[PDB]
Write a protein that binds this ligand. Sequence first.
Ligand SMILES: NS(=O)(=O)O[C@@H]1CCN(S(=O)(=O)[C@@H]2O[C@@H](CO)[C@@H](O)[C@H](O)[C@@H]2O)C1
Ligand SMILES: [Zn+2]
Length: 260
Amino acid sequence: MSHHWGYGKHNGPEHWHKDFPIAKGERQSPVDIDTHTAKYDPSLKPLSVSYDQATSLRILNNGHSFQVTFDDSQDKAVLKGGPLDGTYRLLQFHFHWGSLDGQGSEHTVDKKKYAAELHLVHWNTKYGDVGKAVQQPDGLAVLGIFLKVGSAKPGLQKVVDVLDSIKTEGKSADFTNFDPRGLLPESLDYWTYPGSLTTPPLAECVTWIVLKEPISVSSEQVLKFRKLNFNGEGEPEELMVDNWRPAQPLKNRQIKASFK
Ligand SMILES: NS(=O)(=O)O[C@@H]1CCN(S(=O)(=O)[C@@H]2O[C@@H](CO)[C@@H](O)[C@H](O)[C@@H]2O)C1
Ligand SMILES: [Zn+2]
């Protein structure tokens, strides 16, 4: 682990615990979602996704994934309801994906892996900033959406068409006026459980909300993901693929379903 942590043989998920011991903790993510062990909870409220006033800012290759960042200095794009108390502001979204279509997601469903997984990261406004929020058990809410390969998702195309401009670690570009509502499936049926960040620092601060319905993206769209680089410009080229953490022990946790 040598280390800027990563996803390779010598620095991947099996190594992370040496610098982040909470990697072996009691509420780590992702997990396998066993669909007939998850319990329908009729007391769960509908999810409220209010993204109409979202202000995207930049798109960035951060060396492990790429992310689109939002203005979170006001309640512009917020997640409420469902299992959540209070208001969670959208900070960024990013993806995890594979080298082949049969792997790439972090969560699995009855051990099924998807080609990729979208994470919309939100933080609890009662903690004032995201740095304080990550130190709280209910500091973050991450909305997880599965991607399967099939037909193209029109709302994703603006993202994949700028990836050639952020190929290597550290590169960023203007990415204004992007509407994240174009990345959502029809249904907001979800599973939810208490968990963690799936990358270092692996903080146990996340209420996970994982949508049942995957979105479909085209083979050409995911192929553009796989052209990104882990490396910085000028370094030996290592394609950014398989940047997913595998499923972790569920331990003393129950996954609840919002739907029957
Ligand atoms: N997966 S998640 O739990 O929904 O959110 C985590 C937290 C934020 N991302 S991230 O922006 O992709 C990630 O975060 C950083 C540190 O926490 C970077 O060190 C790093 O370069 C990286 O790409 C993953
Ligand atoms: Zn993620």
